[PDB]
């Protein structure tokens, strides 16, 4: 699994469950091409977005749908979503974990990059 | 100032100085139109972005050029930039402070909405 | 002011107002002795904790009563409090801002050390 | 495993490996009694601190030795350590994950509480 996303709820002390995550890859014409999407599990984790074969070099955007998450809990959040944009695999394949921590008016994201 | 942006360097323990920040407002056709911009001061703050008259309800995007910030310090960054996207709702007034805390492989952002 | 503390509510998007903050300095016997204290203002800031003369090099502990803050809002908190422990080293001057960002089950803290 | 600690390095984009973690429990006389200690693995995780039998109700302090971590990397950090203090199991056994994100001048901690 070369790309994993894990989301926690800092406000409620739980995994952020059923969070929609959309991944895009910058195309030759500078537009964002859809790449992969999924939802976090009961543990707040999203595995299986992509494969070693599919996850080529490129600029990737990971958009976490924080707004729908809060609205489903009956909460009016500040942000529309949380975006993480990065260049991947520039010096050969790496494994990326994008960790996100959510509160209605704040979020943090961190990347863990490991050499497989 | 209805909108202020404050950027801190959480790795080196300083304000993030001379960081480029661009603000966009969402247009009817779903494209982003430039709205305000500037560079953070020695205190990491960017004041005077907009006026009460210009800052109407809508969806705003704040794009912080974190990549150039880290490269100017000789430090390899993870992100291409940091984006903060939010809806301004009248409510009330109010005044919005968008704070961003930067590390080479992480950032956090918080909104402070005061009377 | 060589030492300032700023507390923000990351869950509700406001300054954390009227939060009790106690500062201690480490004594020779490894016990914590009270040094300064106060309650955050309407801006979430606590100014005037100490003076240049009183704030010598040493190990300092800042204890923020986050539990009472959340209970006053009717929100169940995880932590008993939030503690920030650090060494003040002359260096240079300098001026220290301890910022804390609070949510019911999380907090972050960053130090900003300016000239 | 009723108590787990996971530590990430936000400055370097890696798990925080070999981080010392000390846990204390508030005693009857209001002193901190040593409870458990360990070091994070290559994945930045620390399992096996305690057991269901040992982890009774109480006020617990989890002290993460962030200073030694940074000093071992040759970095002068701001903080002496990162403390997390909380009341545990007040309404019966729960599983706690304490997640920490470290930078030389900043850290964040979050708790995930689940009902086993």
Curated annotation (Swiss-Prot), chains A, D:
Changing residue 51 to A: In AMYLD1; amyloid polyneuropathy and cardiomyopathy. Changing residue 41 to I: In AMYLD1; amyloid cardiomyopathy. Changing residue 110 to M: In Chicago variant. The modification Sulfocysteine is found at residue 1. The modification 4-carboxyglutamate is found at residue 33. GO terms for biological process: negative regulation of glomerular filtration; phototransduction, visible light; purine nucleobase metabolic process; retinoid metabolic process. GO terms for molecular function: hormone activity; hormone binding; identical protein binding; molecular sequestering activity; protein-containing complex binding. Changing residue 26 to N: In AMYLD1; amyloid polyneuropathy. Changing residue 75 to S: In AMYLD1; amyloid polyneuropathy; almost no RBP binding. Glycans are attached at residue 89. Keywords: Amyloid, Amyloidosis, Cytoplasm, Disease variant, Gamma-carboxyglutamic acid, Glycoprotein, Hormone, Neuropathy, Phosphoprotein, Secreted, Signal, Sulfation, Thyroid hormone, Transport. Changing residue 46 to P: In AMYLD1; amyloid polyneuropathy. Belongs to the transthyretin family. Tetramer dissociation and partial unfolding leads to the formation of aggregates and amyloid fibrils. Small molecules that occupy at least one of the thyroid hormone binding sites stabilize the tetramer, and thereby stabilize the native state and protect against misfolding and the formation of amyloid fibrils. Thyroid hormone-binding protein. Probably transports thyroxine from the bloodstream to the brain. Each monomer has two 4-stranded beta sheets and the shape of a prolate ellipsoid. Antiparallel beta-sheet interactions link monomers into dimers. A short loop from each monomer forms the main dimer-dimer interaction. These two pairs of loops separate the opposed, convex beta-sheets of the dimers to form an internal channel. Homotetramer. Dimer of dimers. In the homotetramer, subunits assemble around a central channel that can accommodate two ligand molecules. Interacts with RBP4. It is linked to Amyloidosis, hereditary systemic 1: A form of hereditary systemic amyloidosis, a disorder characterized by amyloid deposition in multiple tissues resulting in a wide clinical spectrum. AMYLD1 is an autosomal dominant form due to transthyretin amyloid deposition. Protein fibrils can form in different tissues leading to amyloid polyneuropathies, amyloidotic cardiomyopathy, carpal tunnel syndrome, systemic senile amyloidosis. The disease includes leptomeningeal amyloidosis that is characterized by primary involvement of the central nervous system. Hyperthyroxinemia, dystransthyretinemic: A condition characterized by elevation of total and free thyroxine in healthy, euthyroid persons without detectable binding protein abnormalities. This is Transthyretin. It comes from Homo sapiens (Human). The gene is TTR. The chain holds residues 30 to 145 of 147 of the full protein.
